[PDB]
Structures are given as structure tokens and as C-alpha cells.
């Protein structure tokens, strides 16, 4: 968010409108890895073995 | 699309149709077809080279009649050698001659030689005979 | 060629390496459909010149 | 002054190529037939 | 020995058939019939495999 | 304006007259009319040329004659022969146009292979040119 | 090839200089500068577009006087 | 006087003015040549900024 | 990289030193998050051993 | 960050490229020391488990 804010304060205004699709999809992709993803050493169970 | 959009026209005044290879020059708000690069430079005043532009873009700008000097040179690349060398040559058939101009350093290999010392040659012109030696006739 | 294959295939032996190869042909055929259909619909050219 | 164009080259003969192509077409069809029928 | 010897006349006869100067088109069917003759003789004779 | 209109294969063209406050071109396109040089001071040549939507480049006229019109407003004659056609392209069938209009555009030399095969050291200079104003 | 495009001589008879745009046409083993595309097509007999060639390559082949129809 | 010699063999004159020299890209020092040798090449039209600012409908062929 | 490049083509050139620190630090985070999911254990049944 | 910012306000602007590599690499070392500080694990007591 800081990168986008820095660019907006700088005045490029490149991310306005449809250009925003790059930050938006990245922010969503990061969200998937941190909350879901896969279990650790104490979570050996998974769909392929169950 | 963001790294190179369609609206970035007018980068230079000498443009060439990327497909047809045709050459155009911009004056005011119109595009005029030019006969050659030499006359395109002189009209514009810049020592530039043609910039290739997509043919779909040049069709959206108003035309004009042909401009320039017909038959002028089409390419420039100035060169400066260490020394300047010229030869004028005559070669006789066996009742007939041809004249050649050479620009650059000659090739003196083989039986070719400088006419130094007592060497000489004799030729005809206007009925008179002339002896060539010491670099004079 | 279809009748020829239909008559000979049921009474011959094929090694695992070849049976595994014919399976992958289906997937290799499925993958290019979407990348090609959008090309035929001119979408990539339409977007690049917006 | 008029430009001096070179004389165009003659097209290669198609007859040797067609019989040569006919040779492989014929030989492979002939050889394949005796191999296939013998399986019966 | 007799069978093996018969292949050469048949081979050059096919190679020489095309008209005009000798070159590329003669080699195409010349080596072609030589290939089929040996392959054909091998299966039905079952000998001299090398 | 006099107007001539025709559809391919119809037995006759339609001739009409139009009038109004301005030439029949949209105000958005008004700025791209071409202004000719007009070296012929007689009343036999036009002052301006405009190419609207769906115009025609390769044209035939009423034994028939073939002509090619450039975007600069000049017209060039094309030989009827297979050589000239096959060499330039122009294999498609030309559109029809009336001689009373087509003759108003300035004419260049015909595109015949028999005369393109020439060499030169220098070309002749053009008399009576016009000023290019910046 | 994408970073710094160039070209090379091939069978095609209509060529143009990669950096200067000049038009040349081949006749035998010699290159003639042509006044325009129309006469270049008409002299060679092939309906085609010019092939861009590296300027250091064009300089090696022999030349001839200008050819074609002026103003076409 | 200053001249330009083309690869095709013709020679063209250059008007010795700051604007012509800079427009063509000839702000450089020229090499010497003798008139006996140079006079033998065919001469084309003169290169100058005024000579090029002209429009033509179509070119003639004498 | 696309998000970064798109800003340079607009000419804002806000990156370098102070600016570049954001994408530089942000880049390490992605590698750590995907590495953490794969680093769940270590045991082998590889072809060379089978 | 305060130490770095104070130098820019003075105008020496020695950072960027050659200079920035010191604070960039130095910044990693601090995080690496706190990581060793949170060392150990596998205790797995938590309010949701109790």
C-alpha cells in the first residue's frame, strides 16, 4: 500500500482506473498464501493422503 | 499497453511508413510525401534519419502534394581519410579508348610500375606525337 | 486408418511407457484451446491497442 | 538510356521428378502389400 | 548368393529409368528400391541377417 | 453539387443535385481536404480533392481504360496486360467511375513495364513549381 | 534478435537499407538504386514489399545508375 | 568550393552556408581534390534549403 | 516487476535509493512465504534409491 | 532510518547504489538477530486448544 501511496503522492496517477488491476490482483494473491496454503510439520494430514 | 500506447505520435519530423517504406515529412499540421532523404532534411532543418511508424497512424493525418528536389542523394555518411588520392586513366583497345576515374589508393602490384628513371611512352594527339617522361608531356 | 487401428489394437501388447504416452496426448490437446480461441477472437490485439 | 536485363533461366524438367516420385509411390505400395497380406 | 546377386541389376534398372542428365532424381528411386528389396528378401529368407 | 451514384451490376447510375451552406463533408473531417497545385490555369482542373469513407483506388471507365488514384490526388494509367497487372498486384476487379469527374484530377505517366527499364545520371528539373509555406 | 533488430540478404530482389530507408533493386549481380516502389515492382515483376537489410552488407555489392519512373 | 560525391558516381554541389551545412550534417572539414579529376563526374542539381521548399503535382520526363 | 516497470514508462522514476527499498524488502517476503510451505519435512524414496 | 534520513536533509545524498548497499545489508542483520531471539518451539499450548 505504501508503494501505491508513494506513487500517488509523487503525482504519476498511473494506477487510476483500470491500471489498478495490478496492485489489486497481487494483494489478493498474497492473501491466499498467508491464510490458506498448507499445514506444517504438526499437520501431516492433507487431501492427497486422507 | 501502458509501456507503449497508441497516442505517442510526433516523436520526430521525418517518419517512414513501417510497412510500405514510404517517406513523409511533417510541416504545420499536415504530412507531405518527400522525394528523398536529402530534401526531407533540408525542409525540416534537422540532420535526423527516418523513424518507422505504423501505416494505420499516417492515414489519419492530412496529405499534401509531392515536395523536394528530384534525384537528390538518398543517404549520407561523411568520411575523412588520412590522405587524398585521385587518378585519371586511359586504356587503349586492339582505334578505341576508355577513360576511368579512380578515387582512393591505387594497387601497384603485378607488372604495374611507376614510370621513373629513363622509362617513357609515346602517344598521338591531333597528329602530333608526345613523349611522356619526368611526369610531363 | 481408423479401421486398421480398431482391428489390430485389441490383440497386441504395449509397454507401460507407451500407454503413459497416449494418456498425455489428451491433456496436451486440451491446453491450447483457450489460448487459441481468444487469439481467433482478436482479444490480445484488441487489448494491446486498447 | 535503356536498361540491360539478363536472360531468364529455363525451368527445370518436371518429367524426371514425376517418374521418380512415381517410383517411390509404386515401390512402397508394392513392398507394403506383400508384407501386409503375409500376416494372414 | 544367387538371390543377393539378382538385386543389383533390378536396382540400377530402376535408377536409370528417369530421362535427362544423371543427378538427384535418379538417386531417389535407385536407393528406394534397394531399400525395399533387401528388407523384403530378409523377412522371407530369414538368413544372412548381418 | 452534381452527384453520380451506382451499385455494381445496375443498368444505370443515378444523377442528382444537392445544395446547402457547405460542401457535403462533416465538420470533423473538414480539416483534411487536400489543396492541389493546379499548374493548368484553364477551367479544366479542380482546386481541391476529398476522399470520404469507402472510397475507391483502382477504377475503370467506359475499349475500357484502367486508372489508379493516389492519396495525394494524382491519377496514373495502368496497362491492361497480364504482366503489368501481375507485377503491381491489382488482380481484383475495379470499381466504376464517370469520366466527367475523374478527368478533373492531374495526370502522371502510365505504369508500363516497357518504359520503367531505363537508367539516368540526373533527372530533368520541374518548371513552374509552387511554394511550400511553413 | 528482438533487442536490436537487423536483416540479411536473401533471395528476394527488393531491398532497403535498415537505417537510411533507401530503396535498391537487384539485376543480376548488381544493385541499382530505385526511385520508388512502383517502378521497383514493375522492373522485377514481383508484387512485394522491401526487405530491410543491414547497411554494412549493402555497401559490399556493386552499383549502377538510378532506375525507374520519376514521381510514380 | 564544396561538393558531395555519391556511390553511384554523380557529384552534387553544397551551398556554403551555416544552415545548409548543419541541416545536412556536413559540419566537418572537407578533403581536397583537383579540378582535372573531379570535372569528369556528372553534375546534378544543387543542394540548398531554398531549392527544396517547393511543391509539385507530378514530375515531367523530357 | 510489471507493477514496477509500468511506473518507469510513465516517467515518474520515483525508485532508486529511498523508493527501491520498498520493492526490495517486499520481494524477500514472497520467497519466505512460499519457502515455508515447502519446508514441511525431509525424507526420501527417490528413483536412485528404489 | 533516522540516521539515514538526517544525511539527506544535509544534502550530501551519498546514498543510492554504492552507498545504499551498506544500510540495505545492515538492515538484514538486525532481523536475523531477532529471529534467533524467538528461537525454539514445538510447545503448542494455546487458548483455542485449552
Swiss-Prot record, chain C:
UniProt-annotated location(s): Cell inner membrane
Phenotype of null mutants: Mutants are defective in the secretion of EsxN, PPE41 and PE_PGRS proteins. Mutant is highly sensitive to detergents and hydrophilic antibiotics such as ampicillin, vancomycin and bacitracin. Virulence is attenuated both in macrophages and in the severe combined immune-deficient mouse infection model.
Transmembrane segments: 27-47
Function recorded in the entry: Part of the ESX-5 specialized secretion system, which is responsible for the secretion of EsxN and a number of PE_PGRS and PPE proteins, including PPE41.
Family, similarity comment: Belongs to the EccD/Snm4 family.
Quaternary organization: Part of the ESX-5 / type VII secretion system (T7SS), which is composed of cytosolic and membrane components. The ESX-5 membrane complex is composed of EccB5, EccC5, EccD5 and EccE5.
Miscellaneous: Was identified as a high-confidence drug target.
Protein name as it appears in the record: ESX-5 secretion system protein EccD5
Full-protein positions shown: 454 to 503 of 503
Curated annotation (Swiss-Prot), chain D:
Cellular location(s): Cell membrane
Membrane-spanning segments: 15-35
Gene name linked to the record: mycP5
Family: Belongs to the peptidase S8 family.
Induction profile: Constitutively expressed during growth in culture.
Disulfide bonds: none
Protein name, entry field: Mycosin-5
From Swiss-Prot, chain F:
Cellular localization per UniProt: Cell inner membrane
Coiled coil: none
Homology family: Belongs to the EccB family.
Subunit comment: Part of the ESX-5 / type VII secretion system (T7SS), which is composed of cytosolic and membrane components. The ESX-5 membrane complex is composed of EccB5, EccC5, EccD5 and EccE5.
Note: Part of the eccB5-eccC5 operon, which is essential for in vitro growth.
Function: An ATPase (shown for residues 80-506). Part of the ESX-5 specialized secretion system, which is responsible for the secretion of EsxN and a number of PE_PGRS and PPE proteins, including PPE41.
Name by which UniProt lists this protein: ESX-5 secretion system ATPase EccB5
Organism: Mycobacterium tuberculosis (strain ATCC 25618 / H37Rv)
Lineage per the UniProt record: Bacteria, Bacillati, Actinomycetota, Actinomycetes, Mycobacteriales
Residues of the full protein shown: 363 to 504 of 506
Curated annotation (Swiss-Prot), chain H:
Domain of life: Bacteria
Signal peptide positions (record): none
Subcellular location: Cell inner membrane
Task performed by this protein: An ATPase (shown for residues 80-506). Part of the ESX-5 specialized secretion system, which is responsible for the secretion of EsxN and a number of PE_PGRS and PPE proteins, including PPE41.
Miscellaneous section: Part of the eccB5-eccC5 operon, which is essential for in vitro growth.
Annotated family: Belongs to the EccB family.
Subunit structure, interactors included: Part of the ESX-5 / type VII secretion system (T7SS), which is composed of cytosolic and membrane components. The ESX-5 membrane complex is composed of EccB5, EccC5, EccD5 and EccE5.
Name of the protein in its database record: ESX-5 secretion system ATPase EccB5
Organism: Mycobacterium tuberculosis (strain ATCC 25618 / H37Rv)
Origin organism lineage: Bacteria, Bacillati, Actinomycetota, Actinomycetes, Mycobacteriales
Amino acid at each position: 500500500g505504501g508503494m501505491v501511496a508513494m506513487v500517488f503522492a509523487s503525482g504519476s496517477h498511473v494506477f487510476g482506473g483500470i491500471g489498478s488491476i495490478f496492485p489489486l490482483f497481487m494483494m489478493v494473491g498474497i492473501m491466499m498464501m498467508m491464510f490458506r496454503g498448507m499445514g506444517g510439520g504438526q499437520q501431516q494430514m492433507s487431501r492427497p493422503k486422507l | 499497453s501502458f509501456i507503449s500506447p497508441s497516442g505517442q505520435l510526433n516523436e520526430s519530423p521525418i517518419i517512414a511508413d513501417r510497412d510500405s517504406g514510404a517517406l513523409y515529412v511533417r510541416v504545420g499540421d499536415r504530412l507531405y510525401p518527400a522525394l528523398n532523404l536529402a530534401s526531407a532534411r533540408l525542409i525540416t532543418g534537422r540532420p535526423d534519419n527516418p523513424h518507422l511508424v505504423r501505416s494505420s497512424q499516417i492515414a489519419t493525418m492530412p496529405r499534401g502534394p509531392l515536395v523536394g528536389i528530384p534525384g537528390a542523394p538518398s543517404s549520407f555518411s561523411p568520411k575523412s581519410p588520412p590522405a587524398s588520392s585521385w587518378l585519371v586513366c586511359d586504356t587503349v583497345a586492339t582505334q578505341g579508348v576508355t577513360v576511368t576515374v579512380i578515387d582512393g589508393t591505387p594497387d601497384l602490384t603485378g607488372h604495374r610500375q611507376i614510370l621513373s628513371g629513363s622509362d617513357a611512352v609515346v602517344l598521338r594527339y591531333g597528329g602530333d606525337a608526345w613523349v611522356i617522361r619526368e611526369g610531363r608531356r | 486408418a481408423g479401421m486398421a487401428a480398431a482391428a489390430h489394437v485389441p490383440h497386441t501388447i504395449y509397454s507401460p511407457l507407451f500407454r503413459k504416452f497416449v494418456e498425455w496426448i489428451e491433456y496436451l490437446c486440451l491446453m491450447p484451446i483457450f489460448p487459441l480461441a481468444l487469439w481467433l477472437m482478436n482479444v490480445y490485439a484488441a487489448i494491446r491497442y486498447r | 538510356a535503356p536498361l540491360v536485363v539478363p536472360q531468364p533461366p529455363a525451368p527445370r524438367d518436371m518429367v524426371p521428378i514425376w517418374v521418380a516420385a512415381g517410383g517411390l509411390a509404386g515401390a512402397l505400395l508394392i513392398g507394403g502389400a506383400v508384407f501386409g497380406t503375409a500376416t494372414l | 548368393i544367387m538371390l543377393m546377386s539378382a538385386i543389383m541389376p533390378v536396382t540400377v534398372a530402376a535408377a536409370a529409368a528417369p530421362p535427362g542428365p544423371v543427378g538427384s532424381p535418379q538417386a531417389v528411386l535407385g536407393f528406394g528400391v534397394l531399400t525395399v528389396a533387401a528388407a523384403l528378401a530378409l523377412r522371407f529368407t530369414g538368413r544372412r541377417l548381418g | 453539387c452534381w452527384w453520380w451514384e451506382r451499385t455494381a451490376g445496375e443498368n444505370r447510375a443515378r444523377v442528382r443535385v444537392v445544395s446547402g451552406p457547405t460542401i457535403p463533408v462533416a465538420a470533423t473531417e473538414m480539416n483534411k481536404v487536400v489543396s492541389l497545385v493546379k499548374a493548368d490555369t484553364s477551367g479544366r482542373q479542380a482546386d481541391q480533392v476529398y476522399f470520404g469513407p469507402d472510397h475507391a483506388n483502382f477504377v475503370a471507365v467506359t475499349s475500357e481504360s484502367l486508372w489508379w488514384v493516389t492519396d495525394a490526388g494524382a491519377r496514373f494509367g495502368v496497362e491492361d496486360s497480364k504482366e503489368a497487372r501481375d507485377a503491381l498486384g491489382l488482380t481484383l476487379t475495379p470499381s466504376l467511375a464517370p469520366w466527367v469527374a475523374l478527368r478533373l484530377l492531374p495526370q502522371g505517366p502510365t505504369l508500363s513495364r516497357a518504359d520503367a527499364l531505363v537508367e539516368h545520371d540526373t533527372l530533368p528539373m520541374d518548371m513552374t513549381p509552387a511554394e511550400l509555406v511553413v
